[PDB]
Design a protein around this motif. Structure first.
Motif, short mmCIF file in Angstrom:
data_model
loop_
_atom_site.label_atom_id
_atom_site.label_comp_id
_atom_site.label_asym_id
_atom_site.label_seq_id
_atom_site.Cartn_x
_atom_site.Cartn_y
_atom_site.Cartn_z
N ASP B 21 -59.14 -20.30 62.56
CA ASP B 21 -59.86 -19.24 63.28
C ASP B 21 -61.32 -19.63 63.24
OD1 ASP B 21 -57.33 -18.12 63.10
OD2 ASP B 21 -58.03 -16.40 61.90
N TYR B 23 -65.57 -18.87 64.96
CA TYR B 23 -66.48 -18.02 65.75
C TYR B 23 -67.23 -18.88 66.77
CZ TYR B 23 -70.22 -19.47 62.46
OH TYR B 23 -71.11 -20.19 61.69
N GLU B 54 -57.60 -14.22 76.26
CA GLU B 54 -57.14 -13.01 75.57
C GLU B 54 -56.36 -12.05 76.47
OE1 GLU B 54 -60.00 -11.06 72.90
OE2 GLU B 54 -61.66 -11.55 74.24
N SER B 61 -59.13 -11.62 68.94
CA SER B 61 -60.34 -11.64 68.14
C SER B 61 -60.32 -10.50 67.13
CB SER B 61 -61.61 -11.58 69.01
OG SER B 61 -61.65 -10.40 69.78
N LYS B 69 -67.64 -12.49 64.70
CA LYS B 69 -66.46 -12.15 65.50
C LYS B 69 -65.64 -13.43 65.50
CE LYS B 69 -64.54 -9.30 68.75
NZ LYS B 69 -64.02 -7.91 68.55
N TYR B 70 -64.46 -13.38 64.90
CA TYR B 70 -63.58 -14.54 64.86
C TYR B 70 -62.53 -14.48 65.96
CZ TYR B 70 -65.51 -16.09 60.40
OH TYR B 70 -66.36 -16.54 59.43
N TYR B 71 -62.22 -15.66 66.48
CA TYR B 71 -61.18 -15.82 67.48
C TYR B 71 -60.08 -16.59 66.78
CZ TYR B 71 -64.32 -14.13 71.08
OH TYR B 71 -65.16 -13.36 71.84
#
Lengths: 101, 101
Positions: B21, B23, B54, B61, B69-71
């Protein structure tokens, strides 16, 4: 899905032409043979693709002496594949670094 | 052109996430570093891509504890890359047969 398949069919068709001008039946047959009999390209699908490729000046067609309709990769088509090959090669190196296998 | 670049940026972004994951700033920085300092991804471009990814359930996220903010690559995203890798591998073999280098 459909998108990835069209992207893949595009790549194969351009490579067949890069190797030599060719006609639809011949292209389909040789792609099937070169794929171990797995990838059976649909003729209507090729026409959809060719229509876009010739609008974009990537391929052109002409009569080969009934006469067969031959498709050929244009000078632009050739240039575009060279660009694609070099840029995708760089993408592969990035992936190799990221995976660190 | 723009199309091939978006296709390439898509591939790189998915591979970065597949590895962990991450950002936006981190992704851009690591991609630049892994490309020998050549590929400098544009932040707005990533957002365009992420918005589509998404919507298609490929990435999601969440907040990582200001918070970043992590994806993350979804289970579907993971499955799709496995499918892509296998199908593109087959495309490469076809090309190898056609080129006969």
């Amino acid at each position: 899905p459909k998108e990835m398949l069209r992207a893949q069919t595009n790549v194969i068709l351009l490579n067949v032409l890069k190797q030599g001008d060719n006609y639809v039946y011949g292209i389909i047959k040789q792609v099937k043979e070169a794929s171990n009999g797995e990838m059976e390209l649909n003729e209507a699908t090729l026409y959809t693709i060719f229509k876009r490729l010739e609008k974009d000046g990537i391929i052109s067609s002409y009569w080969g002496d009934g006469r067969r309709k031959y498709y050929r990769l244009t000078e632009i088509g050739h240039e575009n594949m060279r660009l694609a090959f070099e840029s995708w090669s760089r993408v592969d190196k990035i992936i190799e670094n990221l995976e660190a296998n």
